[PDB]
Chain A
């Protein structure tokens, strides 16, 4: 059974002290308790081993404590680059009784940041085939809530767009977002203005970026 971690997710501001707990049923064998940090898209990284010893190069803001069945990871001055899922891992004997905790997500709150917006028309190569993708990019905003609306010749679109979002940025805690509008070449060629309108609490009114085909 995975060891128990608490909470499942938490958020605090830059500079705050936060604590993550790890609890097991059996007592740990010979201080075999370590803590891993996993950033998006990346392998976990060992931050602390044998309960309280820091990996070389890990900043001193991380510390580990506890014993037996109850362990704590503390981050004493939360930074944007600490956005990650943290896992404890333990050994209870020397013959195969070892497991991970369920993970705890850490998010970092910061001030509002408005996105800067970019729009891309379909490339000529893609237009050579029968498909046309239009891409709207929202860069470096906070918080994550954002409405992207596509308009073609001022007609609103639904069902032909998809978005995805990065994780919180290591340097400035912002998100970035891409929205892709998919049309057929035939429908693309019938129309002239392509626009994406962005609504975000950092902008006093919605921002529209657009292009005229050709």
Chain B
């Protein structure tokens, strides 16, 4: 069972941020959904939550700028954050309290993977994907993109996990992000090697073959 989060990724100051958290699978549980955010390099902050009876709770700071709601027909929970500034940049997480409590943080047994939000004036830009060609090393260079996340790098469409290291992105002196994903493989691998890269804010979906 997965909590699938969706949102725009890169937003400009003063806009309304709209996030969704969709329960992807049936659960016979009367569960509650809580929203939490984590600014870069900081800790977890409660935004608010919604109980099994739809009782909606808000943190003192969010009471005047957040609306939380549920659309039961889609099992989709919504968070709206109004008049954002750069200080609302953070990874936003949705989590489930199996007891149905809308104001509790001690028992969040199931989390979404987080949706990254960057509030900024700068323009969205999709990445170029370049092979890093040759035990042996290989990988892909995702270069010149904004904003940082949501960005996804998988290998062989998930089949290759062992030895893979996808590095944190660095802000280049150009002002755009760059990152590399690498995998160490058997020195005499011939085997098809695909890196799958998705930069959702730019609608960029590239599969790239890394050949000798």
Q: Contact: B58 with A49, CB < 8 Å?
A: no
Q: Which residues of B contact A123 (CB under 8 A)?
A: 130-133, 141
Q: Is B103 an interface residue (CB 8 A)?
A: yes
Q: Which residues of A contact B105 (CB under 8 A)?
A: 34, 89-91, 98-100
Q: Given known contacts A120-B133, A133-B130, is B106 in contact with A32 (CB within 8 Å)?
A: yes
Measured CA separation A43–B5 after assembly (Å): 12
Q: Give the chain A neighbours of B133 by CB distance below 8 A.
A: 120, 123
- Does A157 reach chain B (CB closer than 8 Å)? no
Report the minimum CB–CB distance from A105 to chain B (whole Å): 11
Residue of A nearest to B48 (CB): A96
Instruction: Output the least CB separation between B62 and chain A (Å).
Output: 10
Residues of B near A43 (CB, < 8 A) are 93, 95, 111-114
Question: Contact: A166 with B167, CB < 8 Å?
Answer: yes
Interface residue A178 (Cβ < 8 Å from any Cβ of B): yes
Determine if B44 and A100 form an interchain contact, defined as CB atoms under 8 angstroms apart. Answer: yes
Q: Enumerate chain B residues within 8 angstroms of A101, measured Cβ to Cβ.
A: 43
Does B57 count as interface, using CB distance less than 8 angstroms?
A: yes
A163 with B108: CB separation less than 8 A: no
Q: Are A34 and B103 within 8 A (Cβ)?
A: no
The answer to whether A120 touches B132, judged by C-beta atoms less than 8 angstroms apart, is yes
Per the 8 Å Cβ criterion, residues 63-82 of A in contact with B are none
A-contacting 9-mer, from B20-28, B69-77, B176-184, B189-197 = B176-184
How far is the CB of B204 from the nearest CB of chain A, in Å? 15
Does B169 lie within 8 Å of A164, measured CB to CB? yes
Residues of chain B in range 82-109 having any CB-CB distance to chain A below 8 Å: 93, 95, 101, 103-109
In contact, B46 and A95 (Cβ under 8 angstroms): no
B137 at the interface (CB under 8 A from A): yes
**CB pair B114 A133 closer than 8 Å:** no
The distance in angstroms between the C-alpha atoms of A33 and B108, with both chains bound, is 11
Q: Report B-chain residues with C-beta under 8 Å of the C-beta of A102.
A: 43
Using a Cβ cutoff of 8 Å, how many contacts connect chains A and B?
133
A139 touches B137 (CB 8 A): yes
- Asked, given contacts A137-B182, A164-B179, whether A100 binds B45 with beta carbons under 8 Å apart, the answer is yes
Segment 139-159 of A: residues with Cβ below 8 Å from B: 139
Question: Does A125 lie within 8 Å of B131, measured CB to CB?
Answer: yes
In the complex, how many angstroms separate the beta carbon of A9 from the nearest chain B beta carbon?
13
Instruction: Kindly report which residue of chain A lies nearest to residue B169, judged by CB atoms.
Output: A164
Chain B residues with CB below 8 A from A182, complex form: 172-173
Task: Determine the distance from Cα of A123 to Cα of B184 in the docked complex, in whole angstroms.
Answer: 18
Contact A96 B167 (CB under 8 A): no
Contact A44:B111 (CB < 8 A) given known A123-B132, A139-B184, A165-B167: yes
Which residue of A is nearest B94, CB measured?
Answer: A43
For A95-139 the 0/1 string (1 means CB < 8 A from B) is 111111111000000000000101010110110010001010101
Complex alpha-carbon distance, A182 and B130, angstroms? 14
Binary interface encoding of chain B residues 109-120 relative to chain A, with 1 for a CB under 8 A from any of its CBs, else 0: 101111000000
Q: Which residues of B contact A60 (CB under 8 A)?
A: none
Q: Which residue of A lies closest to B113 (CB)?
A: A43
Whether A45 is near chain B, meaning CB under 8 Å from some CB there, is yes
Can you add 11 more A-B contacts, CB < 8 Å, to A43-B95, A87-B43?
A: A36-B108, A43-B93, A43-B112, A44-B108, A44-B111, A50-B106, A96-B60, A98-B104, A102-B43, A116-B135, A137-B139
Using CB atoms and an 8 Å cutoff, list the residues of chain B in contact with chain A. Answer: 36, 43-46, 57-60, 93, 95, 101, 103-109, 111-114, 128, 130-133, 135-137, 139, 141, 143, 165, 167-170, 172-173, 178-180, 182, 184
Chain A residues in the interface with B (C-beta under 8 A): 2, 32-34, 36, 42-46, 49-50, 55, 87, 89-91, 94-103, 116, 118, 120, 122-123, 125-126, 129, 133, 135, 137, 139, 162-166, 176, 178, 180, 182
